[PDB]
Enzyme design. Structure first.
Site, PDB file in Angstrom:
ATOM      1  N   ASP A   1     -11.520  -8.323   7.622  1.00  0.00           N
ATOM      2  CA  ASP A   1     -12.939  -8.245   7.281  1.00  0.00           C
ATOM      3  C   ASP A   1     -13.611  -9.600   7.500  1.00  0.00           C
TER       4      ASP A   1
ATOM      5  N   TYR B   1       0.812  -1.216   0.000  1.00  0.00           N
ATOM      6  CA  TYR B   1       0.000   0.000   0.000  1.00  0.00           C
ATOM      7  C   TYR B   1       0.848   1.269   0.000  1.00  0.00           C
TER       8      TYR B   1
ATOM      9  N   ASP C   1      -5.428  -6.427   6.158  1.00  0.00           N
ATOM     10  CA  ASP C   1      -6.610  -5.795   5.595  1.00  0.00           C
ATOM     11  C   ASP C   1      -7.631  -6.848   5.201  1.00  0.00           C
TER      12      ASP C   1
ATOM     13  N   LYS D   1       2.779 -15.530   2.448  1.00  0.00           N
ATOM     14  CA  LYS D   1       2.781 -16.417   1.283  1.00  0.00           C
ATOM     15  C   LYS D   1       4.235 -16.734   0.932  1.00  0.00           C
TER      16      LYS D   1
ATOM     17  N   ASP E   1      -4.016 -17.957   1.887  1.00  0.00           N
ATOM     18  CA  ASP E   1      -5.199 -18.632   1.356  1.00  0.00           C
ATOM     19  C   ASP E   1      -5.759 -19.631   2.366  1.00  0.00           C
TER      20      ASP E   1
HETATM   21  N1  LIG Z   1      -1.646 -26.882  -6.112  1.00  0.00           N
HETATM   22  C1  LIG Z   1      -0.510 -26.985  -5.420  1.00  0.00           C
HETATM   23  O1  LIG Z   1       0.528 -27.846  -5.826  1.00  0.00           O
HETATM   24  C2  LIG Z   1      -0.326 -26.154  -4.181  1.00  0.00           C
HETATM   25  C3  LIG Z   1      -1.351 -25.297  -3.774  1.00  0.00           C
HETATM   26  C4  LIG Z   1      -1.448 -24.919  -2.435  1.00  0.00           C
HETATM   27  C5  LIG Z   1      -0.521 -25.400  -1.510  1.00  0.00           C
HETATM   28  N2  LIG Z   1       0.488 -26.238  -1.916  1.00  0.00           N
HETATM   29  C6  LIG Z   1       1.479 -26.771  -0.958  1.00  0.00           C
HETATM   30  O2  LIG Z   1       0.874 -27.651  -0.035  1.00  0.00           O
HETATM   31  C7  LIG Z   1       1.570 -27.628   1.193  1.00  0.00           C
HETATM   32  C8  LIG Z   1       0.590 -27.324   2.314  1.00  0.00           C
HETATM   33  O3  LIG Z   1      -0.037 -26.079   2.093  1.00  0.00           O
HETATM   34  P1  LIG Z   1      -1.378 -25.679   2.905  1.00  0.00           P
HETATM   35  O4  LIG Z   1      -1.509 -26.527   4.119  1.00  0.00           O
HETATM   36  O5  LIG Z   1      -1.379 -24.204   3.090  1.00  0.00           O
HETATM   37  O6  LIG Z   1      -2.557 -25.981   1.846  1.00  0.00           O
HETATM   38  P2  LIG Z   1      -3.400 -27.358   1.697  1.00  0.00           P
HETATM   39  O7  LIG Z   1      -4.473 -27.095   0.717  1.00  0.00           O
HETATM   40  O8  LIG Z   1      -2.492 -28.435   1.223  1.00  0.00           O
HETATM   41  O9  LIG Z   1      -4.063 -27.727   3.133  1.00  0.00           O
HETATM   42  C9  LIG Z   1      -4.985 -26.885   3.809  1.00  0.00           C
HETATM   43  C10 LIG Z   1      -5.883 -27.686   4.762  1.00  0.00           C
HETATM   44  O10 LIG Z   1      -6.901 -28.364   4.037  1.00  0.00           O
HETATM   45  C11 LIG Z   1      -6.683 -29.772   4.097  1.00  0.00           C
HETATM   46  N3  LIG Z   1      -6.832 -30.451   2.783  1.00  0.00           N
HETATM   47  C12 LIG Z   1      -6.296 -30.081   1.566  1.00  0.00           C
HETATM   48  N4  LIG Z   1      -6.678 -30.978   0.626  1.00  0.00           N
HETATM   49  C13 LIG Z   1      -7.444 -31.924   1.224  1.00  0.00           C
HETATM   50  C14 LIG Z   1      -8.088 -33.063   0.739  1.00  0.00           C
HETATM   51  N5  LIG Z   1      -7.919 -33.475  -0.523  1.00  0.00           N
HETATM   52  N6  LIG Z   1      -8.808 -33.840   1.626  1.00  0.00           N
HETATM   53  C15 LIG Z   1      -8.892 -33.499   2.966  1.00  0.00           C
HETATM   54  N7  LIG Z   1      -8.254 -32.375   3.438  1.00  0.00           N
HETATM   55  C16 LIG Z   1      -7.547 -31.602   2.578  1.00  0.00           C
HETATM   56  C17 LIG Z   1      -5.293 -29.996   4.684  1.00  0.00           C
HETATM   57  O11 LIG Z   1      -5.245 -31.171   5.466  1.00  0.00           O
HETATM   58  C18 LIG Z   1      -5.052 -28.736   5.492  1.00  0.00           C
HETATM   59  O12 LIG Z   1      -5.519 -28.896   6.815  1.00  0.00           O
HETATM   60  C19 LIG Z   1       2.611 -26.538   1.083  1.00  0.00           C
HETATM   61  O13 LIG Z   1       3.862 -27.113   0.781  1.00  0.00           O
HETATM   62  C20 LIG Z   1       2.133 -25.715  -0.089  1.00  0.00           C
HETATM   63  O14 LIG Z   1       3.225 -25.106  -0.735  1.00  0.00           O
HETATM   64  C21 LIG Z   1       0.583 -26.608  -3.228  1.00  0.00           C
HETATM   65  N1  LIG Z   2     -10.986   3.379   7.113  1.00  0.00           N
HETATM   66  C1  LIG Z   2     -11.673   3.794   6.054  1.00  0.00           C
HETATM   67  O1  LIG Z   2     -12.007   5.154   5.872  1.00  0.00           O
HETATM   68  C2  LIG Z   2     -12.081   2.803   5.008  1.00  0.00           C
HETATM   69  C3  LIG Z   2     -11.885   1.438   5.203  1.00  0.00           C
HETATM   70  C4  LIG Z   2     -12.449   0.534   4.313  1.00  0.00           C
HETATM   71  C5  LIG Z   2     -13.210   1.027   3.248  1.00  0.00           C
HETATM   72  N2  LIG Z   2     -13.392   2.364   3.059  1.00  0.00           N
HETATM   73  C6  LIG Z   2     -14.223   2.864   1.949  1.00  0.00           C
HETATM   74  O2  LIG Z   2     -15.572   2.602   2.219  1.00  0.00           O
HETATM   75  C7  LIG Z   2     -16.316   2.510   1.016  1.00  0.00           C
HETATM   76  C8  LIG Z   2     -17.123   1.217   1.035  1.00  0.00           C
HETATM   77  O3  LIG Z   2     -16.243   0.112   0.901  1.00  0.00           O
HETATM   78  P1  LIG Z   2     -16.801  -1.375   1.063  1.00  0.00           P
HETATM   79  O4  LIG Z   2     -18.207  -1.383   0.658  1.00  0.00           O
HETATM   80  O5  LIG Z   2     -15.861  -2.306   0.438  1.00  0.00           O
HETATM   81  O6  LIG Z   2     -16.583  -1.620   2.645  1.00  0.00           O
HETATM   82  P2  LIG Z   2     -17.557  -1.323   3.883  1.00  0.00           P
HETATM   83  O7  LIG Z   2     -16.848  -1.836   5.095  1.00  0.00           O
HETATM   84  O8  LIG Z   2     -17.890   0.115   3.989  1.00  0.00           O
HETATM   85  O9  LIG Z   2     -18.887  -2.183   3.665  1.00  0.00           O
HETATM   86  C9  LIG Z   2     -18.895  -3.586   3.537  1.00  0.00           C
HETATM   87  C10 LIG Z   2     -20.294  -4.083   3.909  1.00  0.00           C
HETATM   88  O10 LIG Z   2     -20.402  -4.004   5.318  1.00  0.00           O
HETATM   89  C11 LIG Z   2     -21.457  -3.157   5.686  1.00  0.00           C
HETATM   90  N3  LIG Z   2     -21.106  -2.341   6.862  1.00  0.00           N
HETATM   91  C12 LIG Z   2     -19.912  -1.715   7.094  1.00  0.00           C
HETATM   92  N4  LIG Z   2     -19.996  -1.066   8.275  1.00  0.00           N
HETATM   93  C13 LIG Z   2     -21.224  -1.262   8.801  1.00  0.00           C
HETATM   94  C14 LIG Z   2     -21.816  -0.840   9.991  1.00  0.00           C
HETATM   95  N5  LIG Z   2     -21.241   0.055  10.795  1.00  0.00           N
HETATM   96  N6  LIG Z   2     -23.107  -1.218  10.243  1.00  0.00           N
HETATM   97  C15 LIG Z   2     -23.793  -2.023   9.350  1.00  0.00           C
HETATM   98  N7  LIG Z   2     -23.204  -2.458   8.185  1.00  0.00           N
HETATM   99  C16 LIG Z   2     -21.931  -2.069   7.913  1.00  0.00           C
HETATM  100  C17 LIG Z   2     -21.727  -2.269   4.492  1.00  0.00           C
HETATM  101  O11 LIG Z   2     -23.075  -1.888   4.471  1.00  0.00           O
HETATM  102  C18 LIG Z   2     -21.381  -3.181   3.335  1.00  0.00           C
HETATM  103  O12 LIG Z   2     -22.517  -3.949   3.002  1.00  0.00           O
HETATM  104  C19 LIG Z   2     -15.295   2.524  -0.112  1.00  0.00           C
HETATM  105  O13 LIG Z   2     -15.202   3.843  -0.597  1.00  0.00           O
HETATM  106  C20 LIG Z   2     -13.999   2.214   0.593  1.00  0.00           C
HETATM  107  O14 LIG Z   2     -12.949   2.868  -0.055  1.00  0.00           O
HETATM  108  C21 LIG Z   2     -12.848   3.250   3.931  1.00  0.00           C
HETATM  109  C1  LIG Z   3      -9.475   2.965   2.741  1.00  0.00           C
HETATM  110  C2  LIG Z   3      -8.367   2.358   2.372  1.00  0.00           C
HETATM  111  C3  LIG Z   3      -7.091   3.182   2.381  1.00  0.00           C
HETATM  112  C4  LIG Z   3      -8.365   0.865   2.044  1.00  0.00           C
HETATM  113  O1  LIG Z   3      -7.996   0.259   3.257  1.00  0.00           O
HETATM  114  N1  LIG Z   3      -8.889  -0.709   3.743  1.00  0.00           N
HETATM  115  C5  LIG Z   3      -8.626  -1.137   5.090  1.00  0.00           C
HETATM  116  O2  LIG Z   3      -7.743  -0.704   5.839  1.00  0.00           O
HETATM  117  C6  LIG Z   3      -9.539  -2.167   5.645  1.00  0.00           C
HETATM  118  O3  LIG Z   3     -10.353  -2.953   4.995  1.00  0.00           O
HETATM  119  O4  LIG Z   3      -9.296  -2.107   6.855  1.00  0.00           O
HETATM  120  C1  LIG Z   4       1.916 -23.605  -5.461  1.00  0.00           C
HETATM  121  C2  LIG Z   4       2.055 -22.291  -5.448  1.00  0.00           C
HETATM  122  C3  LIG Z   4       2.975 -21.588  -6.443  1.00  0.00           C
HETATM  123  C4  LIG Z   4       1.246 -21.439  -4.480  1.00  0.00           C
HETATM  124  O1  LIG Z   4       0.144 -21.145  -5.277  1.00  0.00           O
HETATM  125  N1  LIG Z   4      -1.029 -21.460  -4.613  1.00  0.00           N
HETATM  126  C5  LIG Z   4      -2.241 -21.782  -5.331  1.00  0.00           C
HETATM  127  O2  LIG Z   4      -2.451 -21.833  -6.508  1.00  0.00           O
HETATM  128  C6  LIG Z   4      -3.320 -22.025  -4.359  1.00  0.00           C
HETATM  129  O3  LIG Z   4      -2.969 -21.859  -3.146  1.00  0.00           O
HETATM  130  O4  LIG Z   4      -4.465 -22.302  -4.807  1.00  0.00           O
HETATM  131 MG   LIG Z   5     -10.219  -4.705   6.268  1.00  0.00          MG
END
Ligand SMILES: NC(=O)c1ccc[n+]([C@@H]2O[C@H](COP(=O)([O-])OP(=O)(O)OC[C@H]3O[C@@H](n4cnc5c(N)ncnc54)[C@H](O)[C@@H]3O)[C@@H](O)[C@H]2O)c1
Ligand SMILES: NC(=O)c1ccc[n+]([C@@H]2O[C@H](COP(=O)([O-])OP(=O)(O)OC[C@H]3O[C@@H](n4cnc5c(N)ncnc54)[C@H](O)[C@@H]3O)[C@@H](O)[C@H]2O)c1
Ligand SMILES: C=C(C)CONC(=O)C(=O)O
Ligand SMILES: C=C(C)CONC(=O)C(=O)O
Ligand SMILES: [Mg+2]
Lengths: 358, 358
Positions: free
Chosen positions: B254, B144, B250, B194, B226
């Site tokens: 949410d 940012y 950020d 990541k 992710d």
């Molecule tokens: N497409 C890819 O080759 C790719 C994408 C993402 C992560 N990875 C790698 O995988 C390893 C682990 O990453 P991670 O844990 O963040 O992601 P992950 O998707 O492998 O696992 C996330 C969670 O979901 C579960 N999960 C995933 N696939 C499942 C399945 N088929 N059945 C039941 N449970 C399942 C895992 O047990 C874990 O608790 C890392 O080395 C990462 O780099 C590879």
């Molecule tokens: N700190 C900040 O000033 C800041 C942070 C994030 C977004 N924004 C700005 O706000 C505007 C809206 O962005 P967005 O829609 O992605 O995010 P948002 O957080 O304003 O809204 C997301 C969803 O949550 C709901 N929501 C948020 N606050 C709520 C509350 N107090 N009570 C009930 N519902 C609530 C909204 O109605 C919307 O449906 C954009 O212009 C964005 O740039 C400003």
């Molecule tokens: C308003 C911005 C500068 C975008 O920043 N958004 C956040 O900080 C958030 O979702 O908290």
């Molecule tokens: C294997 C990587 C290069 C990480 O990329 N990750 C994905 O595509 C996912 O997490 O879905």
């Molecule tokens: Mg946020």
């Protein structure tokens, strides 16, 4: 007499496990509808590091070049943490693979199946509304590939960096893929960015909006990535096509996987502009359950159910595997990752129940 | 009795609406606990644009320079979409404010109140396990603020770019804040990155790991962004302190806010190394509901509570506000965002009810 050629790459972790069940389900599909698949298997990831010595060895890349579709597992594991960054399975094999075949368009379809709301980790009334979503993720650009990236300096001023850079033509092609998929679905595209901060997101948003003029039947909405993360939990039903950058799509598609019940559900296709397609599950190698026959094979299975869809237009064969996963699950059968307490089945046992529904 | 000087920057959208309630609560808290706040109101963001032509007027920045703390609402909205990037409320006012006061440490405490699980959008059994975590988000570095950033070229060769860059000292100070937070809580830091792809995440992970040697009483776990997105849904109870980059904090905060029941529940504190603070809801200006008097003022009200606690160590006064919020919610009053089939109270009603519960 259609004889296509698949380049099966199992990888690491639950890769080889769930890959066996994907083949299992295919072979029944082969001799069920009337086509042949010539499975040629290679080594990729950390496996290729001690069966060749390199995460993507020349041989492996060659086999893909010659196939009409690559079936892929996943790479990565704690064993290879300590290699150099460039020589690990993720940067060393998978990212290179995607770039080499210019597989820019990543498709991750997430849907809550009929009567399976028990699997969904959301509140009953939210889950009841169901949901059916496709994440269209730009796959070969952005911060995962951008230059420059690296590390410089020393001490407390050591500086490390990556570049979220997009060129307009990259945004145009993945956007087109999103609007075309929407036309085949519910004519809604939600584009996800952070255009209030990021320069790259401003270009994303502007290009997506320009592209929308060629698709006046599609409703286009724009939402910020942080809000998207709430909306998926609060109103998953309001989504059709989710158009995302490489990193935002990475993030959002795991969240979507979880709300369908587990990482093990979400299949994925990675396609280039020609239609060549690699098909892997969205998740990774799941080291914490790898080697144990407990691992949802649905994502891997349904991937091939997308391969015959997209790479080979065999709709009946694909609609088969898909409605076969629906029927096994409809009968209360199962792996541990999915909610409800009842004696889970192993990966093998899920492979068979599904191969039988064929 | 000398007053503390509060710069009040209510901003756009729901900002003025919820800020009014925070002021109402603070006036009662001042009487009941014997301290004086001197509110000085300034235009910021879209409101300042409409008054001055500038999202951060010099008068407003002076006001903040002269203040003991800043009570901030939110900025931005559709009226300003078409302005040049640097004139918009977010890049033109909020990010500069954070940067000018060097507010590197962003604290977002997300908690599901005991008994309010019907508000949580997770499945009832998951929501029963509870949820109480704090996002510790690096706020003045990373993508940012990184350079280079901008746009070059034309036609389809137009490129736009942002740089996710961290210096080690930036990661060290935010890591330290997360470990100190963990020491006052449940002694677990989950760091989100990541690191399997991004050079900046590698440095993040290495530096956090090295900082953990200073905190043998604290558990350090590393998780990919992710996957973190899934784990919050599946296992909210497992989190204590969530240490994150600027953009990752950020994004995930949410999602944390939503599982507490609403974006409207999540307050935040932004602190520099000298303990000067800006306090604001974690969410935006909610343009879809702005001006209708329905926005939830709890995030803004609890932001004022963090102000008293963190800027002025008025801990008993801050506790009373939190308890007043919990009692009003326990009594069944709710704004429209808080899931329930009852007639919702307005913004000004919720403020009055919280004020009366002090
Ligand atoms: N497409 C890819 O080759 C790719 C994408 C993402 C992560 N990875 C790698 O995988 C390893 C682990 O990453 P991670 O844990 O963040 O992601 P992950 O998707 O492998 O696992 C996330 C969670 O979901 C579960 N999960 C995933 N696939 C499942 C399945 N088929 N059945 C039941 N449970 C399942 C895992 O047990 C874990 O608790 C890392 O080395 C990462 O780099 C590879
Ligand atoms: N700190 C900040 O000033 C800041 C942070 C994030 C977004 N924004 C700005 O706000 C505007 C809206 O962005 P967005 O829609 O992605 O995010 P948002 O957080 O304003 O809204 C997301 C969803 O949550 C709901 N929501 C948020 N606050 C709520 C509350 N107090 N009570 C009930 N519902 C609530 C909204 O109605 C919307 O449906 C954009 O212009 C964005 O740039 C400003
Ligand atoms: C308003 C911005 C500068 C975008 O920043 N958004 C956040 O900080 C958030 O979702 O908290
Ligand atoms: C294997 C990587 C290069 C990480 O990329 N990750 C994905 O595509 C996912 O997490 O879905
Ligand atoms: Mg946020």
């Amino acid at each position: 007499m259609e004889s296509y050629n698949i380049a099966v790459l199992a990888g690491d972790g639950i890769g080889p496990e769930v890959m066996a069940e994907a083949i299992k389900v295919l072979n029944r599909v082969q001799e069920k509808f009337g086509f042949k698949l010539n499975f040629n298997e290679f080594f990729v990831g950390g496996a290729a590091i001690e069966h060749c010595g390199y995460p993507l060895p020349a041989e492996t890349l060659k086999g893909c070049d010659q196939a009409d579709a690559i079936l892929f597992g996943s790479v990565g594991g704690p064993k290879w943490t300590n290699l150099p960054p460039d020589q690990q399975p993720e940067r060393g094999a998978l990212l290179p693979l995607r770039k080499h075949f210019k597989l820019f368009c990543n498709l991750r379809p997430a849907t809550l199946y009929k009567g399976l709301e028990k699997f969904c980790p959301l509140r009953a009334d939210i889950a009841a509304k169901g949901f059916d979503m496709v994440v269209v993720r730009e796959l070969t650009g952005g911060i995962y590939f951008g230059q420059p990236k690296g590390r410089e300096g020393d001490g407390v001023q050591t500086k490390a960096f990556d570049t979220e850079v997009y060129y307009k033509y990259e945004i145009e092609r993945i956007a087109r893929a999103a609007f075309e998929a929407a036309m085949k679905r519910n004519k809604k595209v939600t584009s996800v960015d952070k255009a209030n901060v990021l320069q790259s997101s401003i270009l994303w948003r502007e290009t997506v909006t320009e592209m929308a003029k060629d698709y006046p039947e599609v409703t286009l909405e724009h939402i910020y990535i942080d809000n998207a993360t709430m909306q998926l939990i609060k109103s998953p039903e309001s989504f059709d096509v989710l158009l995302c950058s490489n990193i935002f799509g990475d993030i959002i598609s795991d969240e979507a996987a979880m709300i369908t019940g587990s990482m093990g559900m979400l299949p994925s296709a990675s396609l280039n502009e020609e239609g060549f397609g690699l098909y892997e599950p969205a998740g990774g190698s799941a080291p914490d359950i790898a080697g144990k026959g407990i691992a949802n094979p649905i994502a891997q299975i349904l991937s091939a159910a997308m391969m015959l869809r997209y790479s080979f237009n065999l709709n009946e064969a694909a609609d088969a595997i898909e409605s076969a996963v629906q029927k096994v699950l409809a009968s209360g059968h199962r792996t541990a990752d999915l909610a409800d307490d009842s004696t889970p089945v192993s990966t093998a046992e899920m492979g068979t129940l599904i191969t039988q529904a064929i």
